[PDB]
Design a protein around this ligand. Sequence first.
Ligand SMILES: [Zn+2]
Length: 278
Amino acid sequence: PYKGWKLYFSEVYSDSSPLIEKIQAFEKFFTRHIDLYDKDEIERKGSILVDFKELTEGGEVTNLIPDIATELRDAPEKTLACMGLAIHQVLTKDLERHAAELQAQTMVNVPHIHARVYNYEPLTQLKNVRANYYGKYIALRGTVVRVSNIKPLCTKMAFLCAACGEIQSFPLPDGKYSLPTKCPVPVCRGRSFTALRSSPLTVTMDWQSIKIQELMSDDQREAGRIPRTIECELVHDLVDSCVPGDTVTITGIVKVSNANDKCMFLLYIEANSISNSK
Ligand SMILES: [Zn+2]
């Protein structure tokens, strides 16, 4: 009933899991506001931009998401996955109905849709970003200083279990090729999988790394303070959205980087959205 379930979740689909409640919550939101977005631009770019003020809007459309501000902040990777599958389920239902009338007068293949929330608040200044912010969703605003070149990045790798024939979409931590340890089905644990590099469950998107420097008051906050910087990882439609010197607003997830000048603990922002003025 959920085509594209493995495009967002590595778990096995079960109607008893708490994910169903969250997914259907955004599904009600996206069905009522489907005319507010361009369904053609969503499918082409593979993403959707949602205003955070629309989600925190009081009323009837946001009836099933009263705690979106806390869940997105403390569990962004789980909230965006449900929000992404929801819009994918809304689009796959709106297109299967369109293809139903064409047949009378049904394989609709909707690709992965990145759920991208912008205009998130409160804004977090870079100096107050501590190590405790790991896994949290925040919004930054700084100057672009460096923009690396675009490179491919294998985010997920499909694996076929030789026991039951199930194909899982296994994420790679840092693009490092790794193998699953157990089959996600609750019956068998084959522990032996074959890589399906040509499978659609194997994700490969354009990757770009940019560096952001905080907005420093050149005289007020210059009383012995150095401008802090942080790396931001753009992907897919966010790639090539800013040049060095631009002032951008970035939302995303704080994560730990894994790659005298060598410090062994660096935080970066997995960019979920970027807004460039110029
Ligand atoms: Zn299996």
